[PDB]
Amino acid sequence: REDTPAGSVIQYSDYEIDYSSPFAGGVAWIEGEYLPAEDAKISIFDTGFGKSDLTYTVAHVWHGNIFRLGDHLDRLLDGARKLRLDPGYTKDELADITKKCVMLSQLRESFVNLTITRGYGKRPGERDLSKLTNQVYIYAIPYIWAFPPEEQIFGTTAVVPRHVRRAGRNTVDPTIKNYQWGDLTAASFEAKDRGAGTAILMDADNCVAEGPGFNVCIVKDGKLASPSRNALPGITRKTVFEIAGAMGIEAALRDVTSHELYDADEIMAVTTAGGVTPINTLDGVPIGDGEPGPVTVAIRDRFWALMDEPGPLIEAIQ
Amino acid sequence: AIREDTPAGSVIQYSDYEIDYSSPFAGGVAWIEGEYLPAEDAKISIFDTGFGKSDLTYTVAHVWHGNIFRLGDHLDRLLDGARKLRLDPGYTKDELADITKKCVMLSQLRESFVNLTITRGYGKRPGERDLSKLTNQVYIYAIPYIWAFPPEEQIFGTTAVVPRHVRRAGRNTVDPTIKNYQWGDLTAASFEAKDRGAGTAILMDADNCVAEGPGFNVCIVKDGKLASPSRNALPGITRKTVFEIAGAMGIEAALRDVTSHELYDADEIMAVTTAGGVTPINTLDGVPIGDGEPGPVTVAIRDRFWALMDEPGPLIEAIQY
Amino acid sequence: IREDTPAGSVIQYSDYEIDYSSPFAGGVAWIEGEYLPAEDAKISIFDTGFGKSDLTYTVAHVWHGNIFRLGDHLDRLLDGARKLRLDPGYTKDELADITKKCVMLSQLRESFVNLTITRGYGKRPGERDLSKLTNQVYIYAIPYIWAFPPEEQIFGTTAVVPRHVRRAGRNTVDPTIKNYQWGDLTAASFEAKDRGAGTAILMDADNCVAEGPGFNVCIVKDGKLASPSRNALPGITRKTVFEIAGAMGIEAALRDVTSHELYDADEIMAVTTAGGVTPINTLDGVPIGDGEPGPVTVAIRDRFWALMDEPGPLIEAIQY
Amino acid sequence: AIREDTPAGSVIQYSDYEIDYSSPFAGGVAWIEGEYLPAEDAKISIFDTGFGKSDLTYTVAHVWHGNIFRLGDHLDRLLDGARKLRLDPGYTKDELADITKKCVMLSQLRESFVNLTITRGYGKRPGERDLSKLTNQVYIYAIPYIWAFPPEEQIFGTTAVVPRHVRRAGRNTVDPTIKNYQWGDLTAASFEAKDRGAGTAILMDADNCVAEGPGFNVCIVKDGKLASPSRNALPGITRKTVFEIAGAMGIEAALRDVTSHELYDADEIMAVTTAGGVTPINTLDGVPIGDGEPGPVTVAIRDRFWALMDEPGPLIEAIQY
């Protein structure tokens, strides 16, 4: 755990881990073996390294509840299929290994990763895709924040990069979650150099794409919009649209132009790693009053209440 | 296997020799977290952000008849990319040279694919957020020779398509001017080439200018002058060598935009990379270039390239086995 | 003027005689508030609609003496004018009245009708200050222009995806506002003609379908229709096609259509004011379906032509 | 109408002369369908596909102190672009030169903006579709001098922004390497620069490389070397002149990609164009370039460029009035 704002909707669990188990605090599952995370190593010759030839997903565990594991496995497996990767495990088999990683970890708040790689052959530097055995790697480790708890509650700041744009769907395709962060990293660097929390990247046509590890939603005239084309089909975004529909807020996946981002009444980053993050400022200009907007507060607070409501989560049997 | 067939009497012949397999380094070495290891033992932390974020750069050098080719030039390119990415190898050029050559020496390979990678690395604990807290890692390996195109295709040529569905990432995205493992577009291009029954793909950039192929630079010949893309392409050391050879032969060679029209109107196309050298491209979208057979400039430059690997000079250093 | 159309096809010109005693007979232009015979129609070389192509326009057709969806065209024309910061200085109902008088005076029952709004010119040639330019409205009704010959409307045309050209994106020369800036379209048409094809289907920056030289592209896949949403003119023919599809129980979506989905389509059609709905039989020489007009394309095209003879809100008969 | 204020003692000064208005050509001449007309009277067919399709190319030459600048180069670039578009002017270079110089003479203007346009034209029928059936048209005019930037800004400099919402059309769309009237992107950029209270816009291409501005090339100076975009930009005659001027001063000048990083980090930025020459850019996105005053290479190149309008030589030719 770490500090969250007092009385805010984000609070870690009160519990102590039994460290007599060497799995305590973090677990990896690799080449069919459960390992302490600090022991988790892969072949340097996995073409998931050499070619970043792989897809992944991340799911969070909050108050011992893993959130939308099924929706996560469905997007993982659909992406795997598109890349011609084969986990060699069923959805239900991967669910049980994931859940057992969390259980061994004893973590009630956990960042959880499933990665499917093209893998390695019998020989180092085997090139025939046909001779490479695809690898599944899973791990469960302490909760990770794209933005700190206090920014979740009080908001962060963004810039649109001067020097970077998002890779297009016809290049390094962002519609399949991948580890190819060349643009996303350069954009994070540009945001830190300019003293800003994060970056919102544009596509080739000056429509919003996404940010380094999150989707973007804007609110204008009480209506929500998130980019349809050059962005990951996020599960936090999916959750946010379900929330909005329940609240009677119109929510469209469509092209959001550069004009629309700069003219927004609210902007938010949505992601598995910390949920809903208000963006108070864009290029050093406040959005609305420069404090988290009211649709972003309502959806963020609703998001975190979901994590204690039996329904679309499952308690880890710790 | 330390060897495979090459066309009999061609300019491509592996070395005749025997590896002493009592040594456990025999046939492949990796240098990981300061330790020499048999290639097959070689593992990195899954929490290296060179995996999780492909936050790294690298170079590939080849060894042919016991000679490492242009190691100086590959360490210059590697460390300049590393500096642009704000990576620090924590080793000097001269130190990385010695560690590379000891990998080859220990492997006993006379023909070798050599990789130097520099990753952003990991922190004290897994998924460290703060970049300032990640320790950059360098990995080096020397394994048996890898061919971007088979020996047979080096001599008889390959075929190529321009993808219907794919383009090269631009320098303002995942920047191709810094060697990287971010191959999403290159893997896609390769699949589309394979589905279309072709040897390979030649990717266009956003402006319908030639970029490069999956693991190689493209050079064209038109009316006896040679050209290769300047923008959305790795500054290849093979391409640098090709330009030097053209220059010596009195052939004009230019780094400039090659338009889609220029690719399609070319008298010769060739692929050039460390991993196999100079590959003639006979056809493009099922239309013969020249006569459908390797071009005269391609052949002369390729044969000179392979002659370079046996000539005492500044481009090669003999591994002291 | 009229043209051979296939015998018994849904496309037939009117049978009628023009009175060539009137100098307006066969083609009218409305320029600087004066009605002229098409052939006398001239604009200042110094109109920045020329030297900058700083303008928007629309095209409506007249078929069997009925002008089709003039209100929709005026709405799109004026919506674009406002986004280019142009002022026609005439209301919708005024332009509607001028347009209908152009056709009446032409006596054409089958007509290509242009409305252009340019930034215009100042008191001097070469005026710099955009604010000192008087915006111009130009309107003509001339004989019917075919984006594809009547024969091709009935029996289909052939398409290529250009090797050398892409559609200008919405952040450059914006295709979502009808314009005369055809550099890409003209390039794409030359490449199609050089490759012996009927026309070109252009991609955008991301390998999504944009549109063709003067038309929207619709695909059919597994009985469902789709048409690009981003780098494409919001076509009024496309709009009719969607309305028809809806009434037929055919699902129809404005969305991204990938290069994949174009090459894998069960049907491809072009849709434009200048000739309606054209089957695309072949793409880069490969048959689409059986290489003859697809079933959904035929049903929708034949419906589209029937709309031009049915009393109702989409047509208005010209009072000759 | 024929002169406006220039800064006193500046290198930019209009000529002292009186025009005889007993000529109907005095102060503006157009040549349209083989007839000389007063500018005021110059009209084209609304059915010219140079209008309805902007299917055309053109060039602009300036006259200064009764001298027309590089008319030969302008005719070469015009005719090259017309052949690329499969336009045929129906006149030779020397015939176009004779008519151009005769427009300037009938104008009586010593300072003049001179436009040659070649259009695809019209057929016998309004709205002919077959390009084979269209008669290519030539339109030439000579009107009073036109300033992309006012004289004051030529001497004391202007301010630029990079657009937030607009990019230059690439060479594979509406090609900027062939001078054209298709200003959709450039007009939107000017409107964004005006809304942002800035002198002008410098547009980027798809790869975040500098393209050009609305009606001008961009040059940057860095560590005393000059660079100007090679790809998505008109090969400008002013830029050509600046590069010749740069070389005669011992300043290195490259046509190459200028990244977004190079533009923002420039020691000097200048706009170069036929309509007013070399304009210093003092500020980019409100950030001063150098000391926020015209740069030393900018000033030296500009002052030399205006001296070229008086020196007898191959760059200028006296109009016989």
Author numbering:
A (entry chain C): 19 to 336
B (entry chain A), D (entry chain B): 17 to 337
C (entry chain D): 18 to 337
Reported in the publication:
Based on the level of thermostability improvement, the additional five mutation sites (S105P, S121M, H152N, A168E and R215G) were sequentially incorporated into M4, resulting in the generation of mutant M9. The activity of M9 was measured as 39.4 ± 1.5 mU/mg, demonstrating a remarkable 16.4-fold increase compared to that of WT. The half-life (t1/2) of M9 at 50°C represented a 208-fold improvement compared to WT. For insatance, the Lys195, located on Loop2 (Chain A) and Loop4 (Chain B), served as the catalytic residue, and the flexible loops of Loop1 and Loop3 were likely involved in substrate binding. Through further rational design using the crystal structure of M9, the mutant M9-1 with an additional 1.9-fold improvement in specific activity was obtained.
The dimeric enzyme exhibited the characteristic structural architecture of class IV PLP-dependent enzymes, consisting of two subunits. The interface between the two subunits constituted the binding pocket for the amino donor and acceptor.
